[PDB]
Amino acid sequence: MRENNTSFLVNVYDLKKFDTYAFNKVFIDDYKIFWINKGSAKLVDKNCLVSYTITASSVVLLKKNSIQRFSLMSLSDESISVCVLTIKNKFVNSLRHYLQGDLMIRNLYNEKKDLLLWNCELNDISVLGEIVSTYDQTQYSEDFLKIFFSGFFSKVEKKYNSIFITDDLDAMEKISCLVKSDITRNWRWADICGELRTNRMILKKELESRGVKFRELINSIRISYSISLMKTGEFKIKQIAYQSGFASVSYFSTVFKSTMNVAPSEYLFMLTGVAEE
Ligand SMILES: CCCCCC/C=C\CCCCCCCC(=O)O
């Protein structure tokens, strides 16, 4: 029996005609890129107060460890499919140490942009479409894709003077890794700074730049954790809530609905296509 893909996750979601998805403080737990298959949609980035029209030749890149606030609204008179490619941590590591030589200008890039737009050449459209076409690819060696994505992320970074793939000494990565190492623990802000051996200073900068309080950040990480659990095959809402560190199903559901603008059971239906029972 062939095995699940170790480098990527592919999830496709139906965007009904003229409907809107709205995300409020969603934590991006891994690097993600997404695109629509046909038609057009309006993307409103509420972090930057910038609006974009995307088409089938656009790809939107979401930075790991960012907190996103945006909406996506279908502009088409037909159902649209949103394809979300998650790049897994094992694979991103390979990318950090792949590109030959030292890129001299990258030290003067900045980290201000967490949502990036790229208008694809058909080269890119071909490769991305084949990746998501079927669970295995086979015709795409892992090395081919490592070369492709390191070159792909390189040119997006150069369009924006911005670091997309960060080093793993990043303070926000250390925080989110620590929280997820014990997701049901009642984390306190002073405990995290203590265990990371970094005072409540450079760490506070990470909350401020994302516009969240500590308790908001923990809730956002826990929602992203619950979505990861649902993707593993866990479909019992009580188990999803408790394993993600929520005190009750009621509160999980309220936070989930505030973050994703749909109820947990609705998201489960979008994910699996199976209505309950
Ligand atoms: C938060 C990233 C979603 C980007 C794509 C938005 C398009 C359709 C909304 C359905 C997806 C809802 C969140 C998906 C969760 C995930 O796959 O990580």
Residue numbers in the entry: 1 to 277
What does the article say, verbatim?
We have presented here the results of structural and functional studies of ToxT that reveal the detailed molecular basis for the regulation of virulence in V. cholerae by the UFA components of bile or synthetic ToxT inhibitors.
We solved the 1.8 Å resolution crystal structure of wild-type ToxT from V. cholerae serogroup O42 strain SCE-256 (ToxTENV256). The asymmetric unit is composed of a monomer of ToxTENV256 in a closed conformation. The N-terminal regulatory domain contains a nine sheet β-barrel with three α helices on one face. The C-terminal domain is entirely α-helical and contains two helix-turn-helix DNA-binding motifs. When aligned to the structure of the AraC dimer, helix α3 of UFA-bound ToxT is at an angle that precludes dimerization. These results suggest UFAs inhibit both dimerization and DNA-binding of ToxT by controlling the positions of α3 and α6, respectively.
